[PDB]
Amino acid sequence: SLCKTRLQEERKQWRRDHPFGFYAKPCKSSDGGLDLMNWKVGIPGKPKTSWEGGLYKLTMAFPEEYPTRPPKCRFTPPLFHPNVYPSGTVCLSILNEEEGWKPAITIKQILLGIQDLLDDPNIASPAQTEAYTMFKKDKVEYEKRVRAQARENAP
Protein backbone atom coordinates (compact mmCIF):
# COMPACT_ATOMS: atom_id res chain seq x y z
CA SER A 1 0.00 0.00 0.00
CA LEU A 2 1.03 3.63 -0.54
CA CYS A 3 0.58 4.54 3.12
CA LYS A 4 2.92 1.81 4.38
CA THR A 5 5.40 2.30 1.54
CA ARG A 6 5.66 6.02 2.24
CA LEU A 7 6.05 5.51 6.00
CA GLN A 8 8.76 2.93 5.38
CA GLU A 9 10.68 5.36 3.20
CA GLU A 10 10.31 8.15 5.78
CA ARG A 11 11.66 5.80 8.49
CA LYS A 12 14.57 4.74 6.25
CA GLN A 13 15.54 8.34 5.56
CA TRP A 14 15.01 9.60 9.13
CA ARG A 15 17.17 6.97 10.79
CA ARG A 16 20.05 7.92 8.48
CA ASP A 17 19.75 11.70 8.78
CA HIS A 18 17.75 13.77 11.26
CA PRO A 19 18.12 17.01 13.26
CA PHE A 20 20.30 16.67 16.33
CA GLY A 21 18.35 16.02 19.52
CA PHE A 22 15.13 14.88 17.80
CA TYR A 23 13.97 11.27 17.72
CA ALA A 24 11.22 9.43 15.90
CA LYS A 25 10.30 5.76 15.64
CA PRO A 26 7.23 3.64 14.89
CA CYS A 27 5.79 1.76 17.86
CA LYS A 28 6.06 -2.01 18.08
CA SER A 29 3.11 -3.78 16.49
CA SER A 30 1.24 -6.47 18.38
CA ASP A 31 3.19 -9.29 16.67
CA GLY A 32 5.39 -7.25 16.83
CA GLY A 33 7.41 -5.83 14.00
CA LEU A 34 6.76 -2.16 13.44
CA ASP A 35 3.45 -0.34 13.73
CA LEU A 36 4.12 2.20 11.01
CA MET A 37 0.85 4.03 11.71
CA ASN A 38 1.83 5.13 15.22
CA TRP A 39 5.17 6.74 16.04
CA LYS A 40 6.71 8.10 19.22
CA VAL A 41 8.84 11.21 18.75
CA GLY A 42 10.81 13.70 20.80
CA ILE A 43 11.33 17.36 19.96
CA PRO A 44 14.09 19.26 21.80
CA GLY A 45 13.69 22.86 22.91
CA LYS A 46 15.79 25.35 20.94
CA PRO A 47 18.92 26.63 22.71
CA LYS A 48 18.77 30.14 24.15
CA THR A 49 15.01 30.04 24.61
CA SER A 50 13.04 29.12 27.71
CA TRP A 51 12.30 25.72 26.10
CA GLU A 52 15.97 24.81 26.19
CA GLY A 53 16.86 21.60 28.02
CA GLY A 54 13.45 20.05 27.52
CA LEU A 55 12.82 17.03 25.29
CA TYR A 56 9.11 17.17 24.48
CA LYS A 57 7.36 13.89 23.70
CA LEU A 58 4.64 13.50 21.06
CA THR A 59 2.75 10.71 19.39
CA MET A 60 2.01 10.82 15.66
CA ALA A 61 -1.03 8.84 14.54
CA PHE A 62 -1.20 8.24 10.80
CA PRO A 63 -4.63 7.66 9.19
CA GLU A 64 -5.14 4.95 6.54
CA GLU A 65 -5.44 7.75 3.96
CA TYR A 66 -1.99 9.24 4.60
CA PRO A 67 -0.23 10.87 2.83
CA THR A 68 -3.45 12.30 1.37
CA ARG A 69 -4.47 13.10 4.97
CA PRO A 70 -2.06 14.40 7.68
CA PRO A 71 -1.09 12.57 10.86
CA LYS A 72 -2.56 13.66 14.19
CA CYS A 73 0.15 14.96 16.55
CA ARG A 74 -0.35 14.98 20.30
CA PHE A 75 2.06 16.05 23.05
CA THR A 76 2.20 13.42 25.78
CA PRO A 77 1.63 14.66 28.35
CA PRO A 78 -0.24 17.76 27.16
CA LEU A 79 1.93 20.82 26.88
CA PHE A 80 1.59 24.35 28.23
CA HIS A 81 1.62 26.42 25.03
CA PRO A 82 -0.87 28.75 23.35
CA ASN A 83 -1.32 26.49 20.30
CA VAL A 84 -1.67 23.12 22.03
CA TYR A 85 -5.19 21.92 22.83
CA PRO A 86 -5.87 20.53 26.29
CA SER A 87 -5.76 17.06 24.70
CA GLY A 88 -2.12 17.69 23.76
CA THR A 89 -3.07 17.96 20.09
CA VAL A 90 -0.92 20.49 18.25
CA CYS A 91 -2.59 23.22 16.20
CA LEU A 92 -0.46 23.95 13.14
CA SER A 93 -1.21 25.02 9.57
CA ILE A 94 0.76 22.25 7.84
CA LEU A 95 -1.08 19.59 9.84
CA ASN A 96 -4.47 20.85 8.62
CA GLU A 97 -5.98 19.18 5.55
CA GLU A 98 -7.93 22.34 4.71
CA GLU A 99 -4.91 24.59 5.07
CA GLY A 100 -1.25 23.68 4.78
CA TRP A 101 -1.13 19.89 4.54
CA LYS A 102 0.24 18.41 1.33
CA PRO A 103 1.35 14.82 0.63
CA ALA A 104 4.85 16.21 -0.02
CA ILE A 105 5.22 17.27 3.63
CA THR A 106 7.67 15.01 5.50
CA ILE A 107 7.93 13.83 9.09
CA LYS A 108 11.08 15.95 9.40
CA GLN A 109 9.22 19.05 8.19
CA ILE A 110 6.42 18.37 10.64
CA LEU A 111 8.74 18.02 13.64
CA LEU A 112 10.85 21.07 12.71
CA GLY A 113 7.60 22.96 12.19
CA ILE A 114 6.38 22.03 15.66
CA GLN A 115 9.79 22.93 17.11
CA ASP A 116 9.63 26.39 15.49
CA LEU A 117 6.14 26.86 16.94
CA LEU A 118 7.26 26.29 20.56
CA ASP A 119 9.00 29.67 21.02
CA ASP A 120 7.02 31.49 18.38
CA PRO A 121 3.34 30.85 19.16
CA ASN A 122 0.70 31.83 16.63
CA ILE A 123 -1.31 34.41 18.55
CA ALA A 124 -4.11 34.40 15.95
CA SER A 125 -5.27 30.86 16.72
CA PRO A 126 -5.33 30.13 20.45
CA ALA A 127 -5.95 26.46 21.20
CA GLN A 128 -5.50 26.77 24.95
CA THR A 129 -6.78 29.67 27.05
CA GLU A 130 -4.38 29.56 30.01
CA ALA A 131 -1.17 29.80 27.98
CA TYR A 132 -2.66 32.20 25.43
CA THR A 133 -3.85 34.82 27.92
CA MET A 134 -0.69 34.56 29.99
CA PHE A 135 1.40 34.88 26.82
CA LYS A 136 -0.41 38.02 25.73
CA LYS A 137 -0.88 39.65 29.16
CA ASP A 138 1.78 38.28 31.53
CA LYS A 139 4.86 37.47 29.42
CA VAL A 140 7.14 37.17 32.47
CA GLU A 141 4.98 34.54 34.15
CA TYR A 142 4.55 32.82 30.76
CA GLU A 143 8.27 32.40 30.22
CA LYS A 144 8.59 31.33 33.84
CA ARG A 145 6.16 28.44 33.43
CA VAL A 146 7.86 27.49 30.16
CA ARG A 147 11.24 27.17 31.91
CA ALA A 148 9.75 24.94 34.60
CA GLN A 149 8.00 22.78 32.02
CA ALA A 150 11.43 22.43 30.38
CA ARG A 151 12.93 21.08 33.60
CA GLU A 152 10.01 18.68 33.96
CA ASN A 153 11.05 17.35 30.54
CA ALA A 154 14.84 16.96 30.84
CA PRO A 155 15.99 13.95 28.79
Added chain:
Amino acid sequence: HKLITLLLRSSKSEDLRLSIPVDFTVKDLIKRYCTEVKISFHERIRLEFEGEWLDPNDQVQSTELEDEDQVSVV
Protein backbone atom coordinates in the same frame (compact mmCIF):
# COMPACT_ATOMS: atom_id res chain seq x y z
CA HIS B 1 32.32 -8.77 7.85
CA LYS B 2 33.66 -6.80 10.83
CA LEU B 3 32.51 -3.26 10.14
CA ILE B 4 29.41 -1.14 10.50
CA THR B 5 29.21 2.48 9.27
CA LEU B 6 27.54 5.02 11.57
CA LEU B 7 26.86 8.75 11.40
CA LEU B 8 27.74 10.45 14.69
CA ARG B 9 26.00 13.80 14.84
CA SER B 10 26.59 16.41 17.53
CA SER B 11 25.47 19.87 18.61
CA LYS B 12 28.89 21.50 18.31
CA SER B 13 31.00 19.24 16.05
CA GLU B 14 30.82 18.55 12.31
CA ASP B 15 29.27 15.23 11.22
CA LEU B 16 31.62 12.26 11.64
CA ARG B 17 31.08 8.98 9.78
CA LEU B 18 33.03 6.08 11.24
CA SER B 19 33.29 2.49 10.11
CA ILE B 20 33.76 0.65 13.38
CA PRO B 21 34.00 -3.08 14.22
CA VAL B 22 30.68 -4.41 15.53
CA ASP B 23 32.44 -6.02 18.47
CA PHE B 24 33.52 -2.62 19.80
CA THR B 25 31.53 -1.58 22.86
CA VAL B 26 29.48 1.60 22.92
CA LYS B 27 32.23 3.03 25.16
CA ASP B 28 34.88 2.08 22.55
CA LEU B 29 32.71 3.85 19.96
CA ILE B 30 32.68 7.04 22.07
CA LYS B 31 36.44 6.78 22.69
CA ARG B 32 37.11 6.53 18.91
CA TYR B 33 34.70 9.38 18.21
CA CYS B 34 36.70 11.50 20.67
CA THR B 35 40.15 10.86 19.19
CA GLU B 36 38.64 11.32 15.73
CA VAL B 37 37.18 14.79 16.42
CA LYS B 38 40.00 15.77 18.84
CA ILE B 39 37.95 16.17 21.98
CA SER B 40 38.80 14.73 25.38
CA PHE B 41 36.99 11.58 26.45
CA HIS B 42 34.91 11.53 29.61
CA GLU B 43 32.44 9.08 31.14
CA ARG B 44 29.43 11.41 31.03
CA ILE B 45 29.41 11.54 27.21
CA ARG B 46 26.45 9.52 25.98
CA LEU B 47 25.09 8.34 22.65
CA GLU B 48 21.39 8.61 21.88
CA PHE B 49 19.52 6.42 19.37
CA GLU B 50 15.73 6.37 18.88
CA GLY B 51 15.18 8.33 22.09
CA GLU B 52 17.17 5.91 24.28
CA TRP B 53 20.67 6.14 25.75
CA LEU B 54 22.95 3.41 24.48
CA ASP B 55 24.57 1.38 27.28
CA PRO B 56 28.38 1.95 27.19
CA ASN B 57 28.95 -1.67 28.16
CA ASP B 58 26.95 -3.13 25.24
CA GLN B 59 28.76 -4.33 22.13
CA VAL B 60 27.63 -2.49 19.01
CA GLN B 61 26.40 -5.79 17.53
CA SER B 62 24.09 -6.15 20.55
CA THR B 63 22.22 -2.95 19.79
CA GLU B 64 19.52 -2.18 17.24
CA LEU B 65 21.96 -0.10 15.22
CA GLU B 66 22.10 -0.75 11.49
CA ASP B 67 24.47 0.32 8.74
CA GLU B 68 24.37 4.07 8.08
CA ASP B 69 22.35 4.78 11.23
CA GLN B 70 22.70 8.18 12.87
CA VAL B 71 23.72 8.19 16.51
CA SER B 72 23.49 11.49 18.39
CA VAL B 73 26.48 12.36 20.56
CA VAL B 74 25.53 14.21 23.74
